Design a binder for these strands. Structure first.
Lengths: 539, 738, 517
RNA sequence: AGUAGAAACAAGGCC
RNA sequence: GGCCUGCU
């Protein structure tokens, strides 16, 4: 009633009539931003300079009927003068503290619910457990780490529609919330905020912060989880490590680690089946995680892992920028390449066809507990530097780079029974078979690679056959460095194809993923994975 | 003994103490008066570095333009803007050859953006030269005034609410024989007309200003601000250029400081460690002199034409328009000049527009020479600036050219034992050239210099040097066998930010935590930063512990609050309470840190929605503060904070009351009143900007009708009220139609 | 389906045709040329034709290559700071009142009453271009006003000043010229452009080095009391607290921290009086609260300021004020340092002497000065110096703790074994402990804030580059340049008249002399 | 006068 | 003498 009367006044006024008739709804935002007020070039000087004047603050005009004109000492608390481009009135800051000492009171039980994230941060810190300070060289690796620790893994656009459906259910538009996760999130969030009386703009902002995922490049050592990055100013330094345990855990860490385990198990089964893709799809449909189905997470969740990527692509979803090989994630960074479809022999005299690439090319190898950088040419490796944590990590990176190089020094180092076919005359992949052969131990590949000199620049460490650092002469091209750059986080989402046997391929024709790159490791899910097809023990 | 801190560098390397060489604790140098002199100087310089070019007279603007592209080749090591179109195109071709499909994909992305993009995004911008008032005005104010003048003249396609339609309207505005603008005096307004040439020079012109708070230079520089017509085309061009630079491992401009450091470290390591021990490798940590002056918009048009190869023609035109306008861009001279008569003891402000006519008795020899050189180019108070870019509007395309020249040393194109690679961010580069001997290094650096002078990219010998690989500098990042912390660039961010009490507290603690994360700030230094920030906070905002005897104008309310409260550890530093912040608690706001210690009465007074102090306008500004970093571009600081009674907005300048444009305040007031009513009708007007193509009143009445019917069917509204509402709905519709 | 149609036509077509290389007349022909363009070895061809003279020959950089930096010649440089640094004197009352817990005017009256020995003031060192009797009359007016405040029952929190001709002159009142329209003043003879010339050249003097030497010295008082922080719960918090305790112990007794506090107080007071009372003149005492080593708190009065009017619009607009400071330093032993100062003789002082009592005279340095909003804002934040300095120290400490896997704060701060070159004696370079380094960097930073100028920024950058060239040479990384004498001319382009910049240049010359060996 | 340094303040407009 | 403004 009050608003329509205001409209009565607006339509009666000619100037208002002008603005209302000519302006469109599209320009309402522009007219919301229409202001003479220039933005402060030096805000500090202008908030230091103004706080020495009477009436430096502004407030709504209702202050005139809520706060008195002066306090007991006689200091004036508000004036009748109005702001420049507003109806608001100029008031001193003593009206604020007066409000805090003599103003109306309310019930702030809503605010913990509103600012949920901040209170989980406080509770996690209050219950955390510190330990010994360990002074030691800190190898800080720049890496993409999620900052928000209660993020429901929804993008800004993805979660703004859930926020609207929760708070503004009639202004959602054509966007239909397909995913089950979104509908559960909607109902649950709707329930807590049934009567919240703070502000729908700040309720929406809070829900955005809580539900919207956020990632930020940060130098990280030690733990990478989300609860471990909010305290990165406290756990990790340049010369000191601080042992610390979060008091709590978040659903996103569990959702991620359980999705990874589920997809790994699914792919492991699907590989031995007759039609891996059909089995994979049927398993992905008949399975769910923590009640919410897994496909919802698969469309909703961005996660970097070979099995998750295979699952997503099999569901026709977008995947990572560059290929995987031997459990490591390679991203090319220079040069072109063409395959050749050529033939060669081994040291055990077995003949094999492979595809060797052309041109000089640089690559950014990546992994779980290591990192590396590679430069090579047609059939020829040029150099490989590694930045792993443990020595066996550097060994893994070096053997992976040598197999990837397709050098004859590696081909002519194969000794023993290495069958390049299955037990039924089925052609396995040569590269993967070499990588499994050289994974028992590569003594001969190390003793046959070669040696070169080094300039001893940067104090870089030498290579190790059997734990013998050599600081002046070492294998050719292979170096080791303290500290790595990670790099791969930026992702140029590439389009791809998939074979029946789960061979991912880019638009060109090269191979990007395969069921052999997924780990052989057997983990234990953090959230309960529930599979209902006929037998509840097959995953 | 006389003390000398520089001798400290005889034991500690210069990179492990470089913070000592940064005098960032004192007032930054500022300009005081007009920037006309620097504008004239820059125009005459950029017309000097291209003087062997060809002159022309524009048939549309009448301006004399100097075109140096495909001009003669340079003969000395002085600056030159004679870029070669064939060489730029060859650079682009080799870039595409080394990174295939990059231009196709970038054009597809930018086409999607063009199809999706809207007009409201132009409100998110810096100061913009309004061409209706000839005055710098906020981006939204300038956009609104331009839209109003367009609709008053006849250009009305923009109701579509698309940026490309606003650009079509800008293009059809130029083919009209007379615009109609409005001018204020002192209170009313007056209609005025602008023939085609006048409107053309107003749409193509740029405003000029002096750049304050710049660290590292004795002499002041000028900067430009474009109008509303160029802003959309330059936005689209920067979208394309960002999309391209994102897919290049050699660019560094679209990424942050940490990604710059990552790229730099990978490149220096690659050129050092990956290269063989037999090869030598040398790093030139260089800069480019007169970068913007020598960057012709015609070669940017060539780059846009190449990048868009085999793309739709509409996309080609929309991206070509911006280089076309920059090639013809004009520069407003500035504020003018002040003249003092000492004998008569008086001062006088002459506007710059009279300089075309003013006698030259009143100027010093330097200014006399500048005016004499610029007068031929002066047309109606503005100087034709065709021969070169003014200040970094096309930054990312320049970075693309730098990455092309850096990519032309891949060793497939040099065809020689030497090669090179590096990282370039506009006006700053690091180039590691690897070669088997010092003759190869010299040949590589000579070919780099020469290939850089054939593309209009000049290398600063004054600011570049070559050493062996392992130590270098890039954008004040000092790499010495690993990156090193500086902390002197980040020093001006360690005080009160000047937004409000809550915001200043949150920003200070978050800046401390960030400087702890990225720039290796220590634990003791972080604690000291907390303590000093809190002292400055308390002294600025007049909020002392409350158990003190500091007599201020705001010491009485704080004492009453201190005495009223039983639990005193629950008060905020803004209300006269203790400081519970430490290293463990840098990631938590000041309201959640103190929530179990607060009294329920104080807790409910502080956190109250009915307060007259808290106002929030849009979701974008709720917790984001534009913070200008020193020796860097103005950034945006996300600051986690809790909405309390301390989260006010501060007052406005209030000088506009004494000027002819005083009636803009009433427009502001009505606009905000109306928008508040619309938000009442549409609750989500603040969160999500409304879209459609309907006049506001029709939506208002339609929502009123829906609300009334719903309320009557099952709500408070009774039949009499519903009838009255529907009667007014009909009355309003009739009034609107009339 | 609707096909999009973005058509260039009319004016923006013609402007389009006039925006190409010179051998083209239409965008369509240029676009066709590009679409048919295929690389055919064009860069190499043009390159060969391009003359050899265009090159980037690398000039080697050796020990004998870098020459010293030339400094300007001219009359000696004069003090620019807004208050006296080493020549300052303190009256005290020993009152247990924290940093701000007082009424500045009441504190000032108490710190002035404790001195007996006042005489009729007379001028000792005149201005040589002004009228010193007006400064004398202004001093006498300040004394009269202080006695008036004393007589009045309640000390005013803020005192206004009368607008006499001495203060109207000394504060620049009715000195600006009137603003008129150019069409009403055209034929005036002396109407001309503002003077825009090179600043007056000035050579380095002996005093900025003694000032820097004394700024790095210890003192008999504490100058920093820090806000409270939370209780330390983690071990790294205890480590940080012990580090900070060492830092503050070494740094709290240092003249640089005294200058930090002086400047912060003075700029706060000046800004607040300027914003609050814009038309009135205002008396502002210079107060600083220390705490002697025994533990008693002490208040200290340095003098008085008299803020003129302050109708400051731009951040560069100037507010004028008259500064008066007590001192014991005779102005007739370094008169070139006091070019802009008037110096009176106001009293006598008997300090604790073993040769009876000395009775050294006591002078008042009076001057007109000015400040801006930005200079005030940046001088209210001199505490940032404490951060930069201590941060660098902490960096060093951590850089050594990383090498030896153990905490090393105690060894450095107590055992004093490590020594960093921190200044050259006639015998040679002499090294000092970590505390001297801390105080030296603090004094550098404080001075940089006090004497901040564009010359300092420029010189800092252009000498950073040369420092890096010398470091590349020191690391045996065969460094080289392309135009080094020009780079020197670019460094020397910034040495004009600023004492701090000339001193930094002298330091750089000494560093180049002692390095490269 | 002073601040400051490539152009400004050292108050501005309105009655 | 009275009001207005202090980045317009």
């Amino acid at each position: 009633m009050e608003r329509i009367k205001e409209l009565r006044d607006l339509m009666s006024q000619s100037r208002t009539r002008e603005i209302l008739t000519k302006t469109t709804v599209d320009h309402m935002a522009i007219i919301k931003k229409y202001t003479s007020g220039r933005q402060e070039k030096n805000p500090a000087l202008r908030m230091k300079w103004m706080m020495a004047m009477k009436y430096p603050i502004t407030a709504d005009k209702r202050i005139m009927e809520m706060i008195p004109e002066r306090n007991e000492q006689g200091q004036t608390l508000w004036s009748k003068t109005n702001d420049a481009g507003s109806d608001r009135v100029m008031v001193s800051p003593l009206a604020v503290t007066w409000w805090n000492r003599n103003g109306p009171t309310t019930s702030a039980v809503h605010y913990p619910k509103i600012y949920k994230t901040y209170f989980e941060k406080v509770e996690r810190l209050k219950h955390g457990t510190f330990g010994p300070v360990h002074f030691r060289n800190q190898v800080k690796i720049r890496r993409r780490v999620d900052i928000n620790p209660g993020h429901a893994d929804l993008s800004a656009k993805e979660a703004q529609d859930v926020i609207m459906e929760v708070v503004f259910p009639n202004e959602v538009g054509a966007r239909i919330l397909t995913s089950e996760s979104q509908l559960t999130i909607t109902k649950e969030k709707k329930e807590e905020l049934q009567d919240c009386k703070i502000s729908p703009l700040m309720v929406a902002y809070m829900l955005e912060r809580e539900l919207v995922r956020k990632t930020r490049f940060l130098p990280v050592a030690g733990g990478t989880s989300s609860v471990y990055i909010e305290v990165l100013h406290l756990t990790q330094g340049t010369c000191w490590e601080q042992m610390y345990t979060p008091g709590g855990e978040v659903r996103n860490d569990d959702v991620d680690q359980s999705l990874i385990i589920a997809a790994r198990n699914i792919v492991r089964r699907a590989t031995v089946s007759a039609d891996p893709l059909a089995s994979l799809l049927e398993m992905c449909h008949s399975t769910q995680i923590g009640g919410i189905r897994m496909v919802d997470i698969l469309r909703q969740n961005p996660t970097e892992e070979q099995a998750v990527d295979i699952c997503k692509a099999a569901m026709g979803l977008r995947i990572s920028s560059s290929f995987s090989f031997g459990g490591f994630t390679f991203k090319r960074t220079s040069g072109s390449s063409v395959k050749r479809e050529e033939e060669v022999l081994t040291g055990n005299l077995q003949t094999l066809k492979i595809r060797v690439h052309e041109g000089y090319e640089e690559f950014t190898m990546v992994g779980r507990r290591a990192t590396a950088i590679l430069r090579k040419a047609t059939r020829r490796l040029i150099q490989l530097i590694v930045s792993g944590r443990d020595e066996q990590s550097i060994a893994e990176a070096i053997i992976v780079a040598m197999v990837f190089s397709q050098e004859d020094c590696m081909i002519k180092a194969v000794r023993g029974d290495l069958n390049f076919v299955n037990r039924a005359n089925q052609r396995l992949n040569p590269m993967h078979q070499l990588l499994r052969h050289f994974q028992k131990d590569a003594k001969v590949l190390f003793q046959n690679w070669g040696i070169e000199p080094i300039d001893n620049v940067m104090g870089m460490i030498g290579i190790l056959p059997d734990m013998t650092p050599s600081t002046e002469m070492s294998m050719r091209g292979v170096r080791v460095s303290k500290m790595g750059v990670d790099e791969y986080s930026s992702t140029e989402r590439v389009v791809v194809s998939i074979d029946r046997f789960l061979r991912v391929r880019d638009q060109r024709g090269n191979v990007l993923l395969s069921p052999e790159e997924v780990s052989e490791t057997q983990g234990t899910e953090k959230l309960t994975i529930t599979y209902s097809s006929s037998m509840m023990w097959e995953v | 003994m006389d003390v000398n801190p520089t001798l400290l560098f005889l034991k500690v390397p210069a990179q492990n103490a470089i913070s000592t060489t940064f005098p960032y604790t004192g007032d930054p140098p500022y300009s005081h008066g007009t920037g006309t002199g620097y504008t004239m100087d820059t125009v005459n310089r950029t017309h000097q570095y291209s003087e062997k070019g060809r002159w022309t007279t524009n048939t549309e603007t009448g301006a004399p333009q100097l075109n140096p592209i495909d001009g003669p080749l340079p003969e000395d090591n002085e600056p030159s803007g004679y870029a070669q179109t064939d060489c730029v195109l060859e650079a682009m071709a080799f870039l595409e050859e080394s990174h295939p499909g990059i231009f196709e994909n970038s054009c597809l992305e930018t086409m999607e953006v063009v199809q999706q993009t809207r007009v409201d995004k132009l409100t998110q911008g810096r100061q913009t030269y309004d061409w209706t008032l000839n005055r710098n005005q906020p981006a939204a104010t300038a956009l609104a005034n331009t839209i109003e003048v367009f609709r008053s003249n006849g250009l009305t396609a923009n109701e579509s609410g698309r940026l490309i339609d606003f650009l079509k309207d800008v293009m059809e505005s130029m083919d009209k024989e007379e615009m109609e603008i409005t001018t204020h005096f002192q209170i009313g307004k007056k209609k005025q007309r602008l023939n085609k040439r006048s409107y053309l020079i107003r749409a193509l012109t740029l405003n000029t200003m002096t750049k304050d708070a710049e660290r590292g230079k004795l002499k002041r520089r000028a900067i430009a601000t474009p109008g509303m017509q160029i802003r959309g085309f330059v936005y689209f061009v920067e979208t394309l250029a960002r999309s391209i630079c994102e897919k290049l491992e050699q660019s560094g401009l679209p990424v942050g400081g940490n990604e710059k450091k990552a790229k730099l470290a990978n490149v220096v390591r690659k050129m050092m460690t990956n290269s063989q021990d037999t090869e030598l490798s040398f790093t030139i940590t260089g800069d480019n002199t007169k970068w913007n002056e020598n960057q012709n918009p015609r070669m940017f048009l060539a780059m846009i034409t190449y990048i868009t190869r085999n793309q739709p023609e509409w996309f080609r035109n929309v991206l070509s328009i911006a280089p076309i306008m920059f090639s013809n861009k004009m520069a407003r001279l500035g504020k003018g000049y002040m003249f003092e008569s000492k004998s008569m003891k008086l001062r006088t402000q002459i506007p710059a527009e009279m300089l075309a006519s003013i006698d030259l008795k009143y100027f010093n020899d330097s200014t006399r020479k500048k005016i004499e050189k610029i007068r031929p180019l002066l047309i109606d108070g503005t100087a034709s600036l065709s021969p070169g870019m003014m200040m970094g509007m096309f930054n990312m395309l320049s970075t693309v050219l730098g990455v092309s020249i850096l990519n032309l040393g891949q060793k497939r194109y040099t065809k020689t034992t030497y090669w090179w690679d590096g990282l370039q961010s506009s006006d700053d580069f690091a180039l590691i050239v690897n070669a088997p001997n010092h003759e190869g290094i010299q040949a590589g650096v000579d070919r780099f210099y020469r290939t850089c002078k054939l593309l209009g990219i000049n290398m600063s010998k004054k600011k570049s040097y070559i050493n062996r690989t392992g130590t270098f500098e890039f954008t004040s990042f000092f790499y010495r066998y690993g990156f090193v912390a500086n902390f002197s660039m980040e020093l001006p961010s360690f005080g009160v930010s000047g937004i409000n009490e809550s915001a200043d507290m949150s920003i200070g603690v978050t800046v401390i935590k960030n400087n702890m994360i990225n720039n290796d700030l220590g634990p003791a230094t972080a604690q000291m930063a907390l303590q000093l920030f809190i002292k400055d906070y308390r002294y600025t905002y007049r909020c002392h512990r409350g158990d003190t005897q500091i007599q201020t104008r705001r010491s009485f309310e704080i004492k009453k609050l201190w005495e009223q409260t039983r639990s005193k550890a629950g008060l905020l530093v803004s209300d006269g309470g203790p400081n519970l912040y430490n290293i463990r608690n840098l990631h938590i706001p000041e309201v959640c840190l103190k929530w179990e210690l607060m009294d329920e009465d104080y807790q409910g007074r502080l956190c109250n929605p009915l307060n007259p102090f808290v106002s929030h306008k849009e979701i974008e500004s709720v917790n984001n503060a534009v913070m200008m970093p020193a020796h860097g571009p103005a950034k945006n600081m996300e600051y986690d904070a809790v909405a309390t009674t301390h989260s006010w907005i501060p007052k406005r300048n209030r000088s506009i009351l004494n000027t002819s444009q005083r009636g803009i305040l009433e427009d502001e007031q009505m606009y905000q009143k109306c928008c508040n009513l619309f938000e009442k009708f549409f609750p989500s007007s603040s969160y999500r900007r409304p879209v459609g193509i309907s006049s506001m009143v029709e939506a208002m009445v339609s929502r009123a009708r829906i609300d009334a019917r719903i309320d009557f069917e099952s709500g408070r509204i009774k039949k009499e009220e519903f009838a009255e509402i529907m009667k007014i709905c009909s009355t309003i519709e009739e009034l609107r139609r009339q | 389906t609707i096909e999009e149609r973005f058509e260039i036509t009319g004016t923006m077509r013609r402007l389009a045709d006039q925006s190409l290389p010179p051998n083209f007349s239409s965008l369509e022909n240029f676009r066709a040329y590009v679409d048919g363009f295929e690389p055919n070895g064009y860069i190499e061809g043009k390159l060969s034709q391009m003359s050899k003279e265009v090159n980037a020959r690398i000039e080697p950089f050796l020990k004998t290559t870098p020459r010293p930096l030339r400094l300007p010649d001219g009359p000696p440089c004069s003090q620019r700071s807004k208050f006296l640094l080493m020549d300052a004197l303190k009256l005290s009352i020993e009152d247990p009142s924290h940093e701000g817990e007082g009424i500045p005017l009441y504190d000032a009256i108490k710190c002035m009453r404790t001195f007996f020995g006042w005489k009729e003031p007379n001028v000792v060192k005149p201005h040589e271009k002004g009228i010193n009797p007006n400064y004398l009359l202004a001093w006498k007016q300040v004394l009269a006003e202080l006695q008036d405040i004393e007589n009045e029952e309640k000390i005013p929190k803020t005192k206004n000043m009368k607008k006499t001709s001495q203060l109207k002159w000394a504060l620049g009142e009715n000195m600006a010229p009137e603003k008129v329209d150019f069409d009403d003043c055209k034929d005036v003879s002396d109407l001309k452009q503002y003077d825009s010339d090179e600043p007056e050249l000035r050579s380095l003097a002996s005093w900025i080095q003694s000032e820097f030497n004394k700024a790095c010295e210890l003192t008999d008082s504490s100058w920093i009391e820090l806000d409270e922080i939370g209780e330390d719960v983690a071990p790294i918090e205890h480590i940080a607290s012990m580090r900070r305790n060492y830092f503050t112990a070494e740094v709290s007794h240092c003249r640089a921290t005294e200058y930090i506090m002086k400047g912060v107080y003075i700029n706060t007071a000046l800004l607040n009086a300027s914003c609050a009372a814009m038309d009135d003149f205002q008396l502002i005492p210079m107060i600083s609260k220390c705490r002697t080593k025994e533990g008693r708190r002490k208040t200290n009065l340095y003098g008085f300021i008299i803020k003129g009017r302050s109708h400051l619009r731009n951040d560069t607009d100037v507010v004028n004020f008259v500064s008066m400071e007590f001192s014991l330093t005779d102005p007739r032993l370094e008169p070139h340092k006091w070019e802009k100062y008037c110096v009176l003789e106001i009293g006598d002082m008997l300090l604790r002497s073993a040769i009876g009592q000395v009775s050294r005279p006591m002078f008042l340095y009076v001057r007109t000065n000015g400040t801006s909003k930005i200079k005030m804002k940046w001088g209210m934040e001199m505490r940032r110096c404490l951060l930069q300095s201590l941060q660098q120290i902490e960096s060093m400490i951590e850089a050594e703790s990383s090498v030896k896997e153990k905490d090393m704060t105690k060894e450095f701060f107590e055992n004093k074994s490590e020594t960093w070159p921190i200044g050259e004696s006639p015998k040679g370079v002499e090294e000092g402990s970590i505390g001297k380094v801390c105080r030296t960097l603090l004094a550098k930073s404080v001075f940089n804030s006090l004497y901040a100028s564009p010359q300092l920024e420029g010189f800092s950058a252009e000498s950073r580059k040369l420092l890096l060239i010398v470091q590349a040479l020191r690391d045996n990384l065969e460094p080289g340049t392309f135009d080094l004498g020009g780079l020197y001319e670019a460094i020397e382009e910034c040495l004009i008249n600023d004492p701090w910049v000339l001193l930094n240049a002298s330091w750089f010359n000494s560093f180049l002399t002692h390095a490269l060996r």
